[PDB]
């Protein structure tokens, strides 16, 4: 209704795992031929016909849209199982959650290496693009060396810097539940990390830092937060003002 009348809607299907079970129930009781995991041959068609209705309409058709966030529960990590196999192929990407990450302290437990968006930047603002590209490169370098950590008792300063950025950034990726932040606030805290200002702060503190820093810019530096949007990106001014703020702040933070 919203998609067809120039409006935009978001739909979460929690979960599609269970709808598939209900559908399999009916299919087996109707004595239709069972297949893998006892699912009917048209199980993929059930979801495909659902998810394709999610779409971005052109200007001629009002420009509205329907975005869909279908959930799938895996069993002991098996993304190759039947229904996950199907929904992974239908969708435009996946945000993968992991238990190990969760208990380690990483929450949301999102796996940055495996999650994807085939749409990617196409639907990312310029400011976020800017900082996100750097962070995705740095994290990617981090992942490569992240194992040598606890055993590299003589790592060169180069690989040792990769590690520091990587812990720093991972920490900036943590985020409390029920507190979705604005895009400008996200670039501002990412900026901190990707600009190396937190390379000296102790990892355990980064979470406390972010929370103070963010509360501070939200209070005293609204003007800077709006500029970050306006300019679309990090302007030459914004880039100076941030430098002043974080430096001083950090200094006070480690008094």
């Amino acid at each position: 209704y919203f998609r067809d009348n120039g409006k935009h809607a978001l739909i979460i299907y929690d979960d599609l795992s269970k709808q598939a079970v209900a559908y399999r129930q009916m299919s087996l009781l109707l004595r239709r031929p069972p297949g893998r995991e006892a699912y009917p041959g048209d199980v993929f068609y059930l979801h495909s016909r659902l998810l394709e209705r999610a779409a971005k309409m052109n200007d001629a058709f009002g420009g509205g849209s329907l975005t869909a966030l279908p959930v799938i529960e895996t069993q002991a990590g098996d993304v190759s199982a039947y229904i996950p196999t199907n929904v992974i192929s239908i969708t435009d990407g996946q945000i993968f959650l992991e238990t190990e990450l969760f208990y380690k302290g990483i929450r949301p437990a999102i796996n940055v290496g495996l999650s994807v968006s085939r749409v990617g930047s196409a639907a990312q603002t310029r400011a976020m693009k800017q900082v996100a590209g750097t962070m995705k490169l740095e994290l990617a370098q981090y992942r490569e060396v992240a194992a040598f950590a606890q055993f590299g008792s003589d790592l060169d300063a180069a690989t040792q810097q990769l590690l520091s950025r990587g812990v720093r950034l991972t920490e900036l990726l943590k985020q409390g539940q029920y507190s979705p932040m604005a895009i400008e606030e996200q670039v501002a805290v990412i900026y901190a990390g990707v600009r190396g200002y937190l390379d000296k702060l102790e990892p355990s503190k980064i979470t406390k830092f972010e929370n103070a820093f963010l509360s501070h810019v939200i209070s005293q530096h609204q003007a800077l937060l709006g500029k970050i949007r306006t300019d679309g990106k990090i302007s030459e001014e914004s880039d100076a003002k941030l430098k002043e703020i974080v430096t001083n702040f950090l200094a006070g933070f480690e008094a």
Binding site: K18, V21, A22, R24, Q25, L28, L29, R31, P34, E37, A38, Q75, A76, T99, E100, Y103, K104, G105, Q150, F151, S153, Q177
Partner: protein
């Protein structure tokens, strides 16, 4: 099979139920009859059941393993209906213990082909999730009365992904997962700190210190978990003095997690200890802070409060 479900739910009736002001219902579904007899006679002794008057605070419903599939498939509903009455016709806090709710599911699978159905995955009936849903949705607090349910849930061949347990997870508000692997080391209750969860574990509910401690314990435990297999081969020598220092506190926390149960005296050969929430948080807080770095790991194995492991530490001299 044999990791502690029943011991632990016996421990809970002993602590929670005995002190409970209100009625209680116990449904033995598809379990051992000897257990029924065990429980019955234990409750008569504690007075929870009184055979000479009207002070009884617990109703019992039984449909054990010696009964045919139809019975085991319907007993839990029997247990459940009694509890439902106390709930609606009184509003009074009703306690409901069910051991083991898997037997309702296993019973169904047992007559499923005779009912004419094509099997679903792993041999289960195709109506497993609906069958479970119409039952479980009755086991619930409502605006009229509140039921605190505790359901023992069997896990076939130890596989938590098995259709049955897997489908039971969303019906709960807190899940205590037991592991043979842990049990196997002598840690009891064999709970898995990296697989047990609870809707109320939120800083805006248990408060910050509680939440922080817990998260702190799981992180140090997950850290160690991910190193075990590694240093098992490579060796500990490469671990920095900071890393190897966490491995000590991980192991201590691991053991401090055990606790002698009143109900398991016959098996531990130890006196049951019971620890208050606050002392629990402090013990763990303290361990996490390096404090008892000087005590031996075994000090922490099978004790009550932290003070007991300090004691034990001394006794370990000889």
């Amino acid at each position: 099979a044999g990791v502690g479900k029943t011991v632990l739910i016996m421990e809970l009736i002993n602590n929670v139920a005995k002190a409970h002001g209100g009625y209680s219902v116990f449904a033995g579904v598809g379990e051992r009859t000897r257990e029924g007899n065990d429980l019955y006679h234990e409750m008569i002794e504690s007075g929870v059941i009184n055979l000479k008057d009207a002070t009884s605070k617990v109703a019992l419903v039984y449909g054990q393993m010696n009964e045919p599939p139809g019975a085991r498939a319907r007993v839990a509903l029997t247990g459940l209906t009694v509890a439902e009455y106390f709930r609606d016709q009184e509003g009074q806090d009703v306690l409901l213990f069910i051991d083991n709710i898997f037997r309702f599911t296993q019973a169904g699978s047992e007559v499923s082909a005779l009912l004419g159905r094509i099997p679903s995955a792993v041999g289960y009936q195709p109506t497993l999730a609906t069958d479970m849903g119409t039952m479980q949705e009755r086991i619930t607090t409502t605006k009229k009365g509140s039921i605190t349910s505790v359901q023992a849930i069997y896990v076939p061949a130890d596989d938590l992904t098995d259709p049955a347990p897997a489908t039971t997870f969303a019906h709960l508000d807190a899940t205590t997962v037991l592991s043979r692997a842990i049990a196997e080391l002598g840690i009891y209750p064999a709970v898995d700190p990296l697989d047990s969860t609870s809707r109320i574990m939120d800083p805006n509910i248990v408060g910050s210190e509680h939440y922080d401690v817990a998260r702190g314990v799981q992180k140090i435990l997950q850290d160690y978990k991910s190193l075990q297999d590694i240093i098992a081969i490579l060796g500990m020598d490469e671990l920095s003095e900071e890393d190897k220092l966490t491995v000590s506190r991980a192991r201590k926390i691991q053991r401090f997690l055990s606790q002698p149960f009143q109900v398991a005296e016959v098996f531990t050969g130890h006196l049951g200890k019971l620890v208050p929430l606050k002392e629990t948080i402090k013990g763990f807080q303290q361990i996490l802070a390096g404090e008892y770095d000087h005590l031996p790991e075994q000090a922490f194995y099978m004790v009550g409060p932290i003070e007991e492991a300090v004691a034990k530490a001394d006794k370990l001299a000889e």
